[PDB]
């Protein structure tokens, strides 16, 4: 075991012990997504209102 990067302050200590060495959508694209979903909601509702109208 090797202890390294040992750091001490009044609050506490930190260190590292090694045991063995080794061997995005734009703002526009998002508003498009929200708007396309809203349009599908609008379309589904319009179909319902059409059905009720008949």
């Amino acid at each position: 075991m090797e202890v390294i990067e040992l750091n001490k302050c009044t609050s506490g200590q930190s260190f590292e012990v090694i045991l063995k060495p080794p061997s995005d959508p734009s703002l526009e694209e998002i508003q498009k997504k929200l708007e396309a979903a809203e349009e599908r909601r609008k379309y589904q509702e319009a179909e319902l209102l059409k059905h009720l109208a008949e």
Binding site: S11, S14, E16, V17, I18, L19, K20, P21, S23
Partner: peptide, 16 residues
Amino acid sequence: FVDWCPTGFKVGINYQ
């Protein structure tokens, strides 16, 4: 541990 990583621990101590 995975081969491409060191076997070890980073340690922190807070006295409170």
